Amino acid sequence: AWCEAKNITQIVGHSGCEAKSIQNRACLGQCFSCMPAQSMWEIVTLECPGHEEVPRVDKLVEKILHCSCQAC
Ligand SMILES: *[C@@H]1O[C@H](CO)[C@@H](O)[C@H](O)[C@H]1NC(C)=O
Numbered sequence: 765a766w767c768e769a770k771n772i773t774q775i776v777g778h779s780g781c782e783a784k785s786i787q788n789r790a791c792l793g794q795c796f797s798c799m800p801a802q803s804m805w806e807i808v809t810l811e812c813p814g815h816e817e818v819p820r821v822d823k824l825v826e827k828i829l830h831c832s833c834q835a836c
Contacts, residue, residue: 765793765794765795765796765833766793766794766795766833767791767792767793767794767795767798767831767832767833768791768792768793768798768831769789769790769791769792769800769801769828769829769830769831770789770790770791770792771787771788771789772787772788772789772790773785773786773787773788774786774787774788776808776810776823776825777810778810778812778821778823780812780814780815781810781811781812781815781820781821782810782811782812782813783810784808784810786806786808786825788825788827788828789827789828789829789831790828791828791831792831793831793833795833795834797833797834797835797836798831798832798833798834799831799832799833799834800828800829800830800831801829801830801831801832801834802828802829802830803826803827803828803829804826804827804829805824805825805826805827806824806825806827807822807823807824807825808822808823808824808825809821809822809823810822810823
């Protein structure tokens with residue numbers, strides 16, 4: 765059995781705003797299920813051009829740090 769958090773790129777988007785891409789991790793493994801074992805949170809600011817009154821939004825994003833073989 766093995767399970768690893770692997771670096772990925774991921775899209776952070778929101779209706780009416782410009783999507784950004786950030787580093788995150790994804791679980792990859794074979795458990796003889798590979799799920800997040802440690803995580804944290806980040807604030808990602810998206811620019812929303814066109815919208816003068818709310819020109820940006822902060823989206824809260826969970827960052828996976830480590831993964832492990834866990835029940836279900
Ligand atoms: C995965 O991402 C972190 C974040 O910067 C980086 O420091 C680390 O070296 C990366 N791991 C690999 C295997 O590239």
